Enzyme design. Sequence first.
Site, mmCIF file in Angstrom:
data_model
loop_
_atom_site.group_PDB
_atom_site.id
_atom_site.type_symbol
_atom_site.label_atom_id
_atom_site.label_comp_id
_atom_site.label_asym_id
_atom_site.label_seq_id
_atom_site.Cartn_x
_atom_site.Cartn_y
_atom_site.Cartn_z
ATOM 1 C CE1 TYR A 22 1.077 -0.270 4.471
ATOM 2 C CE2 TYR A 22 -0.914 -2.327 4.339
ATOM 3 C CZ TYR A 22 0.681 -1.697 5.359
ATOM 4 O OH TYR A 22 0.698 -2.002 5.996
ATOM 5 C CG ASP A 137 -3.026 -7.426 -1.777
ATOM 6 O OD1 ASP A 137 -2.759 -8.431 -1.771
ATOM 7 O OD2 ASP A 137 -2.358 -6.247 -1.365
HETATM 8 O O1 LIG Z 1 -6.663 3.203 5.317
HETATM 9 C C1 LIG Z 1 -5.582 2.483 6.781
HETATM 10 N N1 LIG Z 1 -6.157 2.684 8.217
HETATM 11 C C2 LIG Z 1 -5.580 2.273 8.389
HETATM 12 O O2 LIG Z 1 -5.188 2.745 9.932
HETATM 13 C C3 LIG Z 1 -4.209 2.402 8.072
HETATM 14 C C4 LIG Z 1 -4.813 2.066 6.489
HETATM 15 C C5 LIG Z 1 -4.131 1.846 5.169
HETATM 16 C C6 LIG Z 1 -3.809 1.975 4.089
HETATM 17 C C7 LIG Z 1 -3.997 3.647 4.399
HETATM 18 C C8 LIG Z 1 -4.482 3.291 2.461
HETATM 19 C C9 LIG Z 1 -4.436 2.896 1.530
HETATM 20 C C10 LIG Z 1 -3.516 1.474 1.534
HETATM 21 C C11 LIG Z 1 -4.047 1.092 2.967
HETATM 22 C C12 LIG Z 1 -2.310 1.496 5.781
HETATM 23 C C13 LIG Z 1 -1.943 1.310 6.606
HETATM 24 N N2 LIG Z 1 -1.036 0.498 7.617
HETATM 25 C C14 LIG Z 1 -0.985 0.451 8.404
HETATM 26 C C15 LIG Z 1 0.037 0.212 9.723
HETATM 27 C C16 LIG Z 1 0.306 0.699 10.976
HETATM 28 C C17 LIG Z 1 -1.766 0.599 11.485
HETATM 29 O O3 LIG Z 1 -1.572 0.595 13.516
HETATM 30 C C18 LIG Z 1 -2.906 1.740 10.896
HETATM 31 C C19 LIG Z 1 -2.087 1.564 9.399
HETATM 32 C C20 LIG Z 1 -3.026 1.354 7.897
#
Ligand SMILES: O=C1NC(=O)c2c1c(-c1ccccc1)cc1[nH]c3ccc(O)cc3c21
Length: 276
Positions: A22, A137
């Site tokens: 991501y 995914d």
């Molecule tokens: O939408 C999200 N809300 C989240 O909390 C989040 C998100 C995403 C993510 C955000 C936009 C596109 C793809 C993935 C990745 C992410 N990696 C992370 C790693 C740790 C975490 O505590 C939260 C997230 C996380």
Amino acid sequence: LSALRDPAGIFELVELVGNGTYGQVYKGRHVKTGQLAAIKVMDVTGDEEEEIKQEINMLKKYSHHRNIATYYGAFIKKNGMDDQLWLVMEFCGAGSVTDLIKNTKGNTLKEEWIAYICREILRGLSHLHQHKVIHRDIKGQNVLLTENAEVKLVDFGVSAGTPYWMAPEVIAYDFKSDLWSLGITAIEMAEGAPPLCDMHPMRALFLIPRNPAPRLKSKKWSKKFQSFIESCLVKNHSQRPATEQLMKHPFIRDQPNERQVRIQLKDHIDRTKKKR
Ligand SMILES: O=C1NC(=O)c2c1c(-c1ccccc1)cc1[nH]c3ccc(O)cc3c21
Ligand code: NA
């Protein structure tokens, strides 16, 4: 319409939390309210523009379910240094299911926790499938937990490498491919890693359509859990159950401690924050 606002004075980056398929994800803060949000920061070029706009529309339309992290908005940070797009999402403080496995002793989750997490993924998948959307995914890295132990699905990039969670038909398809990935995620929660993890991605890509449907290595798991994995992992997708059918399975349907499993998970989350 890429004529969005600059985030200055509205949202501030606090710490980096994510670095996966991501991209570079930050823990952000809304200036006026002090509320936390997940901000995905991506470099906006001339070429890459169509793929970013498609992800936003997917999120704007389909993220409004309790088992999917909510879309809050998008910003363009105007800057030799290319402009950055900020994708503002609902924050999931406890991290991923992958982190939960890595932090748990013996790198395995209690069967009752797996049933709760699987049920929540299934409900979120049901919402997406009803809207004729395939996540594409599903993996522990993309299944996040809030501080109150609520389960939320992330990453719609592929919807708009590591083939370990890929269904045989995808490697060779519809909504049923996400249910194979749920089965692989269930094994990932049970064993600490997906089947064929120890192999090179090219060998895994070759082996998945050829090897028979994976099963749990240990005999310690319940007959209900063993049947669930077998129902999820049916190589012939035409014979694989739909989302609504899998929700009715005894492993998902019979979870008496929905309140007492959530409290246990919340206590496990609190122990991870307190102890370092
Ligand atoms: O939408 C999200 N809300 C989240 O909390 C989040 C998100 C995403 C993510 C955000 C936009 C596109 C793809 C993935 C990745 C992410 N990696 C992370 C790693 C740790 C975490 O505590 C939260 C997230 C996380
Ligand atoms: Na939501």
